Amino acid sequence: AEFQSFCSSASHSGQSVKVTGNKVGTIGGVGYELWADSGNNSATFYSDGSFSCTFQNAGDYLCRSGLSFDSTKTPSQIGRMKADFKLVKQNSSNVGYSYVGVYGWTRSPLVEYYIVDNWLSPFPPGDWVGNKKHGSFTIDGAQYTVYENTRTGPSIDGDTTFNQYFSIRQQARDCGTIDISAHFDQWEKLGMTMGKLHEAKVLGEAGNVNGGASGTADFPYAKVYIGD
């Protein structure tokens, strides 16, 4: 079969919570965060992991759901991780950059990481995402372009500087399983060391360096797990 079964059945279920300010929390046993630097935004998070996002006049907006860790263990110490997701795009405007897929951070080193399978922008993110283009790699059965960057901005530690790691899928995917640890393995081969893990979540991010981006997106399936 070409696609995962959840691609045919995904539906929001469980209890939910709507958030409209910057907020980290849990719903059931699912970690969530809504964060934006600006704008009039929201997200709805469900206890089955699924979620939905709205953003208005935002410079950088992130909606994300999944795993929250305590920054004590590397990914290899934690175990092999995966994310199942389904994205349904809706209208947006003035989206200068966007990432959909898996996201998180490490500490020691401080890293913001992305596995990007789709985007809410009109075109995929380009070479501007980082100063170092490692090139094309077969990761998790598909072609990804791998980049690294050093960025200054808000972080889990406060305003500072951090590395960024990116895998950008060469052809968009709107439903499937991201083998997160397979990306981490590739990154380690390229000198992109993972520190102690802070989180691993399904993400929708949209922003504009000058604009405020506006729009909405739906994630009728989103599950991050330590397992096969």
Side-chain angles (χ1 to χ4, degrees):
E2 185 174 4
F3 304 110
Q4 307 268 161
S5 74
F6 59 81
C7 300
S8 298
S9 66
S11 194
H12 295 300
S13 73
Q15 294 77 32
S16 63
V17 63
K18 187 167 180 192
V19 299
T20 66
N22 286 0
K23 190 70 170 69
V24 175
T26 58
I27 179 69
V30 178
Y32 69 77
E33 182 166 354
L34 181 62
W35 185 90
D37 57 19
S38 52
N40 171 47
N41 309 307
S42 78
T44 304
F45 298 106
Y46 297 80
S47 64
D48 71 356
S50 74
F51 63 107
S52 66
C53 312
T54 78
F55 51 99
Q56 193 181 245
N57 300 312
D60 191 15
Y61 169 89
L62 289 81
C63 60
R64 64 189 193 252
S65 170
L67 311 185
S68 307
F69 294 97
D70 59 5
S71 300
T72 59
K73 293 172 174 173
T74 62
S76 67
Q77 293 171 324
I78 290 166
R80 307 297 293 181
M81 286 170 273
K82 301 192 176 54
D84 295 345
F85 80 99
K86 184 175 183 180
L87 171 68
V88 179
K89 298 180 187 182
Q90 300 160 337
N91 306 134
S92 54
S93 47
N94 207 35
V95 176
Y97 64 90
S98 178
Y99 310 111
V100 175
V102 168
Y103 174 89
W105 293 75
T106 70
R107 291 180 161 109
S108 306
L110 190 65
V111 174
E112 184 184 42
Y113 72 86
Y114 291 86
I115 305 161
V116 184
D117 277 18
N118 215 323
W119 40 82
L120 310 183
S121 50
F123 307 107
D127 287 348
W128 54 260
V129 300
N131 68 296
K132 175 66 176 196
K133 185 176 194 182
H134 283 106
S136 292
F137 295 87
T138 309
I139 314 173
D140 189 23
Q143 299 305 105
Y144 284 87
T145 308
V146 176
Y147 301 90
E148 181 181 354
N149 194 41
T150 303
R151 180 159 189 103
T152 297
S155 85
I156 63 171
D157 281 351
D159 288 5
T160 193
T161 290
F162 46 92
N163 283 281
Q164 305 179 296
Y165 303 161
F166 296 86
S167 291
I168 312 292
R169 203 176 168 98
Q170 292 183 359
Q171 179 172 330
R173 176 157 69 162
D174 66 0
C175 186
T177 299
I178 291 167
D179 183 341
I180 298 169
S181 303
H183 290 267
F184 299 166
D185 293 346
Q186 180 64 70
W187 294 348
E188 294 283 348
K189 289 173 187 158
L190 303 171
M192 299 159 61
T193 309
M194 295 295 283
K196 295 174 172 176
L197 193 59
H198 166 79
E199 75 187 314
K201 294 194 172 62
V202 174
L203 172 70
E205 179 168 9
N208 192 310
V209 169
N210 290 333
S214 301
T216 66
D218 193 44
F219 294 85
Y221 210 74
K223 300 190 184 184
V224 192
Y225 52 96
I226 302 162
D228 296 346

